[PDB]
RNA sequence: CAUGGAAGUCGGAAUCCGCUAAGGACUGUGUAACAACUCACCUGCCGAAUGUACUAGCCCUGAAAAUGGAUGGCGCUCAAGC
């Protein structure tokens, strides 16, 4: 749902990559929903995975997903 | 073996925060079983099964932290569990019991006991009476519904089950396993 | 027509072979090397060609 | 490299005896009696418990100690068909033309006959005597079967390869004329 | 992302996490598309070894000619050979 602008049709013929977006607590808000379905230890292992899961929009500018889910040092809620 | 080292820390450290274990001896049960029972005794207690411990638990004799570790030696033969817990016996004695599933036939499975349809009617589509033809098992379509008018044996007590019916069972929601977790002896009780 | 099992179990005995590339003889499937003693045991082996 | 002790065992269930004289070895249960030489091989026979029958080879070289477990199997096969027997099967494969088949009784001795007509359209009535203690037999339970059975597994099955090997097409590709007649189950004759 | 339809398995581009002792955003089979099935990985049985690549001794393959035929002959196999 986090897409660049919107997708009009008849332009996905061609590459449609450009669905970069932002990276901060937008997503991870939306992690809340799902509320860690399978174990997971509450939503600690779900920030983790819903972090890392949007691997190809390569988070916000020069973070990548992967570097912020690794680096365990932002607070759990 | 990353892996592997992590286990040995693992056994040693949780063995004697916790005064009680008790054994479980599960056998050829569906792993999602073992997935409910984990999450729903995910509060209190924690299950961990492995490879044999053939020196990792003698390893604990060795030294005088608990003379009855070496107790417990023989007991262990093969595909006999653990369970980690600080709750009562009285109350794990059947918590563990739960969600005993309905194990379905796999072409060939001994029946323990003599299996039969009683009479009645499957309510099914009459497109599959071919299935029943092949065992040549009496029935009659009423209403657009298969009717077994008479009784027939399936497959005698220890006996294996006709490819034929035991796919013929899944669908009548009859079969002879019942899966559940067992219970060991456990600490000369 | 010939029923899908028979025709299966017929092949076994005549289609899925090695072949080896120095004396033409046919081997098992699993094999590494000829069993005769003209070409001296050799291990260059094909599969045998199937049909189509 | 020679090994000083290579040693094997073969246990014998209490229904039937077995005895062993001169490197002889006859063995008698309920389904009959069969009989084999092995004067060929040096080994050395024991009895190791009440119901064990040990055999070893002292000083053997590599080659030698091979033949130690082949001679084990052959004996334990022999116990095996005087007390459940074997039985083969095999099958039919056409494609135009149908496969007859004659199993006529015992010729006046205890052989049987098999006569196969009709093989790929042919003329020849071709002919395959059996060796003693095999009966041939038409199956009932489904069409186009034979079923061998006996008491010793090297009679049985040397006999069902016998007719394999007749029915042959020649001068053809082989991979599109399938014509035959196959082999398809080993079993017992008792489970 | 793709879309009459592609749920691992037309195709294009990425490869994280939960639960565990272990099972891959999968090596095939397979569905209009799901499914089903296989593999991968781990567990139960057993009882002490196992896997890959190289070096050089005897032997074997490579080894086809014209009268009958020559380790000198007979013959020899834990040799009467090296
Ligand atoms: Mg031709
Ligand atoms: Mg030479
Ligand atoms: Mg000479
Ligand atoms: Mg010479
Ligand atoms: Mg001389
Ligand atoms: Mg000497
Ligand atoms: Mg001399
Ligand atoms: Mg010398
Ligand atoms: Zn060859």
């Given at each position: 749902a986090l897409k660049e602008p919107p997708r009009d049709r008849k332009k996905e013929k061609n590459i449609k990559h450009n669905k970069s977006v932002s990276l901060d607590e937008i997503i991870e808000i939306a992690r809340t929903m799902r509320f860690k379905s399978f174990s997971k230890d509450l939503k600690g292992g779900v920030k983790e995975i819903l972090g890392t899961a949007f691997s190809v929009g390569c988070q916000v500018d020069g973070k990548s997903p992967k570097a912020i889910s690794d680096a365990i040092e932002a607070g759990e809620i | 073996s990353g892996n592997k080292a992590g286990y040995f820390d693992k056994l040693k450290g949780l063995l004697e925060e916790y005064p009680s274990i008790f054994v479980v001896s599960?056998?050829?049960?569906?792993?999602?079983?073992?997935?409910?029972?984990?999450?729903?005794?995910?509060?209190?207690?924690?299950?961990?099964?492995?490879?044999?411990?053939?020196?990792?638990?003698?390893?604990?004799?060795?030294?005088?932290?608990?003379?009855?570790?070496?107790?417990?030696?023989?007991?262990?033969?093969?595909?006999?569990?653990?369970?980690?817990?600080?709750?009562?016996?009285?109350?794990?004695?059947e918590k563990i019991l739960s969600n005993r599933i309905k194990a379905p036939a796999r072409a060939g499975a001994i029946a323990p006991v003599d299996?039969?349809?009683?009479?009645?009617?499957?309510?099914?589509?009459?497109?599959?009476?071919?299935?029943?033809?092949?065992?040549?098992?009496?029935?009659?379509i009423a209403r657009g519904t298969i009717e077994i008018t008479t009784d027939i044996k399936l497959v005698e007590a220890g006996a294996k089950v006709g490819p034929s019916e035991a796919t013929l069972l899944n669908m009548l929601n009859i079969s002879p396993f019942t899966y559940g977790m067992g219970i060991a002896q456990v600490y000369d009780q | 027509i010939i029923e899908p099992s028979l025709k299966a179990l017929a092949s076994k005995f005549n289609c899925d072979k090695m072949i080896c590339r120095k004396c033409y003889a046919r081997l098992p499937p699993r094999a590494t090397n000829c069993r005769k003693r003209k070409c001296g045991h050799s291990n260059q082996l094909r599969p045998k060609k199937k049909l189509k | 490299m020679r090994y000083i002790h290579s040693e094997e065992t073969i246990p014998v269930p209490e229904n039937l005896k077995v005895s062993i004289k001169s490197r002889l070895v006859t063995v008698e249960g309920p389904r009959g009696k069969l009989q084999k030489d092995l004067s060929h091989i040096a080994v050395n026979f024991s009895v190791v418990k009440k119901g064990v029958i040990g055999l070893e080879i002292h000083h053997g070289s590599r080659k030698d100690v091979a033949a130690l477990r082949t001679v084990r199997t052959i004996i334990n096969n022999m116990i095996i068909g005087v007390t459940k027997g074997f039985k083969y099967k095999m099958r039919y494969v056409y494609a135009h033309f149908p496969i007859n088949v004659n199993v006529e009784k015992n010729a006046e001795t205890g052989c049987y006959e098999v006569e196969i007509r009709?093989?790929?359209?042919?003329?020849?009535?071709?002919?395959?005597?059996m060796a003693p203690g095999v009966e041939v037999e038409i199956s009932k339970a489904q069409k186009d079967?034979?079923?061998?059975?006996?008491?010793?597994?090297?009679?049985?099955?040397?006999?069902?390869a016998d007719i394999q090997?007749?029915?042959?097409?020649?001068?053809?590709?082989?991979?599109?004329?399938?014509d035959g007649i196959y082999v398809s189950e080993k079993g017992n004759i008792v489970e």
């Open positions: - | 599960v056998d050829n049960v569906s792993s999602q079983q073992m997935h409910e029972i984990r999450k729903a005794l995910r509060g209190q207690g924690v299950v961990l099964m492995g490879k044999n411990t053939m020196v990792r638990r003698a390893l604990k004799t060795f030294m005088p932290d608990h003379p009855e570790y070496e107790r417990l030696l023989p007991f262990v033969k093969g595909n006999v569990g653990f369970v980690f817990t600080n709750g009562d016996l009285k109350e794990v004695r299996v039969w349809v009683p009479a009645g009617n499957t309510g099914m589509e009459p497109g599959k009476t071919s299935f029943f033809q092949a065992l040549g098992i009496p029935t009659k | - | 009709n093989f790929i359209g042919e003329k020849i009535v071709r002919k395959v005597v079967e034979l079923i061998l059975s006996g008491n010793s597994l090297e009679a049985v099955s040397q006999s069902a090997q007749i029915c042959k097409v020649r001068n053809k590709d082989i991979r599109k004329f399938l």
